[PDB]
Design a protein around this ligand. Structure first.
Ligand SMILES: OC[C@H]1O[C@@H]2O[C@H]3[C@H](O)[C@@H](O)[C@@H](O[C@H]4[C@H](O)[C@@H](O)[C@@H](O[C@H]5[C@H](O)[C@@H](O)[C@@H](O[C@H]6[C@H](O)[C@@H](O)[C@@H](O[C@H]7[C@H](O)[C@@H](O)[C@@H](O[C@H]8[C@H](O)[C@@H](O)[C@@H](O[C@H]1[C@H](O)[C@H]2O)O[C@@H]8CO)O[C@@H]7CO)O[C@@H]6CO)O[C@@H]5CO)O[C@@H]4CO)O[C@@H]3CO
Length: 87
């Protein structure tokens, strides 16, 4: 697994990260420079995720998106060879 950084820049007071990599639980993100950050060690390959921002599910319009099998919109990124790449 590679260290991988998620950064929410869309504002809010309290933000959780939810994704395929945590079985769609809600990881509290750390407030940092007016943004929210979380760092996970993730295997190389595809990951879907979304944000829970002040009680509302939201995706990041600046990362790629895909429609899940549930009929919902997730972000989709690919972890590659770069420690601490930011998504
Ligand atoms: O919890 C896991 C989950 O979290 C994230 O989903 C959140 C999402 O981002 C929010 O927007 C909100 O979702 C609500 C949504 O906006 C509403 O539209 C409504 O959803 C309705 C759908 O619109 C509608 O399509 C229908 O859904 C049916 C499906 O069409 C049908 O295919 C089937 O779904 C089953 C799947 O086929 C199956 O794969 C399995 O789903 C899993 C996903 O594949 C997987 O990605 C993950 O889902 C994430 C998700 O991607 C995030 O965005 O986990 C799933 C397993 O838990 O299971 C499905 C059966 O449950 O069945 C459904 C009908 O049940 O109906 C709904 C009406 O409810 O409501 C949404 C809120 O419930 O919230 C979610 C978190 O809840």
């Amino acid at each position: 697994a590679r260290p991988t950084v998620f950064r929410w820049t869309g504002g809010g007071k309290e933000v959780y990260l939810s994704g395929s990599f945590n079985n769609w639980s809600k990881l509290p993100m750390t407030r940092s420079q007016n943004n929210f950050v979380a760092i996970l060690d993730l295997p190389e390959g595809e990951h879907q995720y979304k944000f829970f921002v002040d009680g509302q599910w939201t995706h990041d319009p600046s990362e790629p998106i895909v429609t899940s099998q549930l009929g919902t919109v997730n972000n989709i990124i690919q972890v590659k060879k770069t420690d601490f790449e930011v998504f």
